[PDB]
């Protein structure tokens, strides 16, 4: 309803420096940003307050598959290991697996995530209950136009959850241009275009994908907001026409290395004006859902080519503001009228010294373990605890689920 937190360093956005102050929050939004010492309800002196993070690509229930598919090529990973397990993944498991995904993500300062999966209504219930924001999409695939009812399920999800509490939006999730036929992909973009909804898709993830992007550009990509995960093998000849359309790349560095796909040319894309964001992918191919780790790794991989690549401000912009923009939320900046999606970082740690270079440490030294995360003016993680759920009951159900799923 109404509070003032702070009396500590505040980092308003990716482009500025920390200043001592406080933040006034009312009804899930930032009412005022104060400078200097002021009377506050929650004193966080010795800490840093900054905008929360936004993960643009994940499959939340895959936390239940963390570490089950190691040392395999992508085709083996998907058809030999993953699919047989997904066949046994229940609605209840989707729910708890995403409560677990949120518990992990909140510890890393994430306020919202884009999901592409199944049993999405149960995933939505977990997001509702836990407190994060989410752009939820149903994974879509077909065989000659027969999608087994997947788009219909995505439409039911949209009917029931789109817009929920200003926290959940629904989009459509065709898996990729190779698991979706051309006619069906056109049908999906047509649907998203009619509903003014976004589309997310795995695009040029592997080197085997050599289709022309004109095919997709001609069926809706220019008019539908699209979060294209990976883009590792996206041909450079297309960078120029991808700049002025609502096309957002979701860069998933750890997954790309782990599955032997390589390194996306993020620096060249940004140089051509493309919008780039960061995603973690699922827990079976990353293995963590930590966007600070993804951001740091992304910076390092581009620096391998030139140490001046992906500077600190650009990295901080991608994980906060850019990701919130891809998801359609007014977050990413501690400014009057913006969402109260904030993160609290402990500065009394060895890796946060010298104090003079805190922003640099956030990108190149910080553990990624935040002190607290707030979404829509509500604490969803605070000093090791999860105020919105019964952690012990969740732990007991997850232990039962591990036995049940892997007998
Ligand atoms: Ni993925």
From Swiss-Prot:
EC number: 3.5.4.28, 3.5.4.31
Pfam families: Amidohydro_1
Swiss-Prot/TrEMBL cofactor(s): Zn(2+)
SUPFAM superfamilies (alphabetical): Composite domain of metallo-dependent hydrolases (SSF51338), Metallo-dependent hydrolases (SSF51556)
Signal peptide: none
Binding-site residues for substrate, renumbered to this chain: 86, 138, 150, 175, 205, 281
InterPro entries in the cross-refs: Amidohydro-rel (IPR006680), Deaminase_MtaD/DadD (IPR023512), Metal-dep_hydrolase_composite (IPR011059), Metal_Hydrolase (IPR032466), MTA/SAH_deaminase (IPR050287)
Enzyme class: hydrolase
Keywords per UniProt: Hydrolase, Metal-binding, Zinc
Cofactor binding mode and count: Binds 1 zinc ion per subunit.
Taxonomy, superkingdom: Bacteria
Bilayer-spanning residue ranges: none
GO molecular function: 5'-methylthioadenosine deaminase activity; metal ion binding; S-adenosylhomocysteine deaminase activity
Binding site for Zn(2+): 57, 59, 202, 281
Record field: catalytic activity: S-adenosyl-L-homocysteine + H2O + H(+) = S-inosyl-L-homocysteine + NH4(+); S-methyl-5'-thioadenosine + H2O + H(+) = S-methyl-5'-thioinosine + NH4(+)
Family (UniProt): Belongs to the metallo-dependent hydrolases superfamily. MTA/SAH deaminase family.
HAMAP family, sorted: MTA_SAH_deamin (MF_01281)
Function of the molecule: Catalyzes the deamination of 5-methylthioadenosine and S-adenosyl-L-homocysteine into 5-methylthioinosine and S-inosyl-L-homocysteine, respectively. Is also able to deaminate adenosine. Adenosine-5-monophosphate (AMP) and S-adenosyl-L-methionine (SAM) are not enzyme substrates.
Protein name per the record: 5-methylthioadenosine/S-adenosylhomocysteine deaminase
Provenance organism: Thermotoga maritima (strain ATCC 43589 / DSM 3109 / JCM 10099 / NBRC 100826 / MSB8)
Gene designation per UniProt: mtaD
């Amino acid at each position: 309803h109404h509070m003032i937190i702070g009396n500590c360093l505040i980092l308003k956005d990716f482009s500025s420096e920390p200043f001592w102050g406080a933040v006034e929050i009312e009804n899930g939004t930032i009412k005022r940003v104060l400078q200097g010492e002021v009377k506050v309800d929650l004193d966080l002196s010795g800490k840093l307050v900054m905008p929360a993070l936004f993960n643009t690509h994940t499959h939340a229930p895959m936390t239940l598959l963390r570490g089950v598919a190691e040392d395999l090529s992508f085709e083996e990973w998907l058809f030999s290991k993953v699919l047989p397990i997904e066949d046994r993944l229940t609605e209840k498991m989707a729910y708890y697996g995403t409560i677990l995904a949120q518990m992990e993500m909140a510890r890393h300062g994430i306020a919202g995530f884009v999901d592409m999966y199944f049993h999405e209504e149960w995933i939505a219930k977990a997001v509702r209950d836990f407190g994060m924001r989410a752009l939820l999409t149903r994974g879509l695939v077909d065989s000659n136009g027969d999608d087994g009812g997947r788009l219909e399920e995505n439409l039911k999800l949209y009917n029931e959850w789109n817009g929920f509490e200003g926290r959940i939006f629904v989009g459509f999730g065709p898996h990729s241009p190779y698991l979706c036929s051309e006619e069906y992909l056109k049908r999906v973009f047509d649907t998203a275009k009619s509903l003014n909804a976004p589309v997310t898709i795995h695009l040029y993830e592997t080197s085997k994908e050599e289709y022309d992007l004109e095919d997709i550009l001609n069926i809706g990509l220019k008019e539908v907001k699209t979060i294209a995960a990976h883009c590792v093998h996206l041909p450079e000849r297309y960078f120029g026409v991808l700049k002025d359309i609502p096309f957002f790349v979701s860069h998933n560095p750890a997954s790309n290395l782990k599955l032997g796909n390589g390194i996306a040319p993020v620096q060249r894309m940004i140089e051509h004006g493309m919008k780039v964001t960061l995603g973690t992918d699922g827990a079976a191919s990353n293995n963590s859902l930590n966007l600070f780790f993804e951001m740091r790794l992304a910076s390092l991989l581009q620096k391998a080519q030139n140490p001046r690549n992906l500077d600190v401000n650009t990295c901080l912009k991608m994980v906060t503001y850019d990701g919130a923009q891809a998801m359609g939320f007014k977050s990413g900046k501690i400014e009057e009228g913006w969402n109260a999606d904030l993160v609290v970082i402990d500065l009394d740690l060895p890796e946060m010294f010298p104090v003079q270079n805190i922003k640099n440490h956030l990108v190149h030294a910080f553990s990624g373990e935040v002190f607290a995360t707030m979404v829509a003016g509500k604490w969803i993680y605070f000093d090791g605890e999860y105020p919105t759920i019964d952690s012990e009951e969740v732990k007991r159900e997850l232990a039962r689920i591990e036995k049940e799923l892997y007998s």
